[PDB]
Design a binder for this molecule. Structure first.
Ligand SMILES: Cc1sc2c(c1C)C(c1ccc(Cl)cc1)=N[C@@H](CC(=O)NCc1ccc(/C=C/C(=O)NO)cc1)c1nnc(C)n1-2
Length: 126
């Protein structure tokens, strides 16, 4: 069975808007989301439909861009680092579960290259 998805709303979690978080939505997420290779990462891994019964035995901190998108739209984060960590968790999970040269790894690598290029221009905090 699939686990519940990561939370995207929690009144107990401190949060704010920052210009860096705005950039993470308007530049970083938008750039990756529209990419031809985005689709496997646009929602949680459905280990039932994909017949990956071991997925959530290996991947204990799942993350995906659907979750990130909702978190950004909900202003769920306190700082840019929290959101950058979610992106890196997503990429790392893919590399942990899969193997070098797999199609899904090539897709993650293409998205990660753009992620790195955009994060390199993260604005200074206002
Ligand atoms: C909806 C999702 S989420 C997700 C995947 C898919 C289809 C994929 C995946 C996505 C795109 C591509 Cl091109 C190949 C595999 N992988 C699995 C992991 C997975 O099933 N591995 C086995 C697998 C199954 C089918 C193919 C098909 C190739 C093909 O060319 N189809 O004809 C290859 C390996 C995986 N990991 N991390 C993520 C994220 N994924």
């Amino acid at each position: 069975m699939n686990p519940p998805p990561p939370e995207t709303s929690n009144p107990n979690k401190p949060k704010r808007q920052t210009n860096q978080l705005q950039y993470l939505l308007r530049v970083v997420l938008k750039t990756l989301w529209k990419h031809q290779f985005a689709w496997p990462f646009q929602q949680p891994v459905d280990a039932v439909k994909l017949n990956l019964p071991d997925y959530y035995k290996i991947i204990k901190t799942p993350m995906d861009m659907g979750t990130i998108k909702k978190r950004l739209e909900n202003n769920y984060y306190w700082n840019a680092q929290e959101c950058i960590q979610d992106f890196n968790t997503m990429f790392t999970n893919c590399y942990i579960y899969n193997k070098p040269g797999d199609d899904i790894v090539l897709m993650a690598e293409a998205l990660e290259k753009l992620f790195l290029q955009k994060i390199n221009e993260l604005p200074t905090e206002e």
